[PDB]
């Protein structure tokens with residue numbers, strides 16, 4: 001069901017949840033004045049969610065959340081990323097360079113306080129109401145001087161909600177000694193890594209295991225050999241009960257952003273500029289990269305990761321535009337604003353209508369600037385690697401005309417450093433030139449001559465429209481065209497060379513027009529932000545916060561629904577639950593994506609599933625729910641009707657991407673790894689029996 005609900009909204013929502021099959025007492029889920037399941041939830045490493053699953057501070061999150069730390073402890077001798085990692089005692093658990101988990105100790109509604117401070121600001125157009133500086137000073141004030149010093153490990157933050165109509169103060173408890181305890185092999189942790197990304201059905205055991213270490217008193221402490229595991233206020237019990245179709249599921253985690261209060265004009269702008277330009281341009285870039293990856297096995301190695309990375313937001317935009325096209329997103333925003341305009345006329349205030357009008361007019365006015373911005377960002381800044389070639393810094397240009405000879409050698413040393421980072425092991429000028437020709441051709445078609453970055457004018461003025469010739473010249477003549485050409489430059493460096501270098505001119509020309517469009521576009525954000533405060537204020541006053549959740553802003557939220565499959569298209573039905581048999585069907589030992597660990601293979605053939613199989617003796621892998629999630633919900637605990645852990649959220653299907661603007665009851669699903677599979681892989685792949693023994697595993 002719809003919504004990423006504030007903890008303080010539990011009471012307003014309990015009735016709907018109780019009806020969807022929730023059985024816990026309210027204050028056992030969230031209690032502002034006592035221990036609750038909320039205290040088992042962490043923000044893991046500043047982005048992901050995790051959860052505490054033992055009285056000895058064991059933490060579950062996704063494999064993709066623990067990836068960097070599993071890789072940091074990976075050498076070619078002991079490759080943990082490949083084979084997994086299973087510390088057989090506490091002492092073998094590996095500490096991590098720059099890690100955190102953050103508990104949400106306390107949450108207070110500080111609206112009346114913040115609105116009261118706000119009246120001491122003269123300028124009625126002040127953007128301080130959404131400013132991290134000002135909200136943080138309002139937090140320090142309300143907490144005390146030397147609060148971080150008085151209560152060590154604790155910190156405070158105020159955040160805006162509902163476009164500045166509601167403020168919450170968070171007291172955060174931060175632990176910094178978080179050790180790697182367990183990881184499955186990446187074959188399991190990343191099964192179908194790229195193919196099955198945003199895909200249901202899904203067969204990935206996307207989980208890793210860490211432990212929170214603290215001082216003797218369980219107070220936060222940086223890494224010390226003398227740190228001992230944290231005894232936490234609360235951990236999740238693990239259910240073996242399983243799930244069945246229409247079972248109550250609920251989630252707690254840290255969803256990043258939503259756009260629930262977009263006007264119709266904003267959905268049109270999202271479609272017609274942001275999404276259509278990203279689709280057009282990444283299609284061209286992806287087409288040229290693919291062709292060259294197929295042609296040469298070395299280019300494939302060099303360009304595989306850059307290809308995958310472009311693909312990520314490419315698929316998201318396709319998913320997004322599909323929803324605009326088919327799920328009536330534009331219509332439903334138009335309806336919401338028309339209901340409020342109508343209610344506003346009768347209430348005798350035009351403020352709401354004046355607010356929607358301000359947004360519409362602002363969107364219409366910025367359309368050219370924004371089209372140009374996206375064209376240059378998708379087309380050139382992301383499109384063409386040689387846009388990110390070295391610009392001699394103001395200091396560097398100076399120190400080449402410098403009397404002092406020590407300071408020219410040092411300027412050329414860090415221009416060499418920056419050239420080496422640009423023309424790395426994975427850079428091909430031949431590939432970049434072909435991408436650049438195709439991307440620039442499309443760019444020159446859409447952007448008229450008078451709006452071009454100054455250097456791109458030369459295609460028309462010097463090269464008679466020949467994009468190929470323009471690009472060939474950039475590499476022929478530039479000190480960054482080849483190692484040899486840079487080596488010739490570095491031995492006899494004049495600034496008169498750099499100043500006129502066609503690649504430095506292209507790169508600086510392009511970042512100039514990028515910056516300039518950013519600067520002319522910035523002023524248009526404020527009037528929308530301010531009208532949005534009024535718009536949401538009206539929406540709340542009209543209908544209440546009951547069926548109108550606050551956009552996600554990287555804050556702790558709960559979502560609820562049922563375990564339920566869906567129909568993606570005519571005569572096709574995806575069920576609520578994948579099984580290990582899905583693993584075997586997709587196996588292909590000659591595709592890294594779909595390698596099956598032999599230890600799991602055997603577990604399958606033996607039917608060695610202990611208390612973890614579904615009562616038909618099938619082995620669950622993943623399940624999906626009508627819960628409302630977005631990025632930030634990676635690693636989020638999935639609870640049954642009694643608050644027992646049944647799974648671990650790890651993705652969302654592509655048909656639900658537009659759920660960030662409008663919840664999609666019959667398409668959008670959270671993709672969840674079954675806790676029974678997690679237990680299976682720990683037991684039968686890792687042999688890490690002490691982890692089962694420290695958990696409170698319930699029937």
Ligand SMILES: NCCNc1ccc([N+](=O)[O-])cc1C(=O)O
Pocket residue numbers: 064197198629630631632633634649650651652670
């Ligand atoms: N699979 C890469 C991680 N991305 C996500 C993880 C979780 C969720 N979620 O709805 O909870 C969404 C995404 C995402 O890519 O949008």
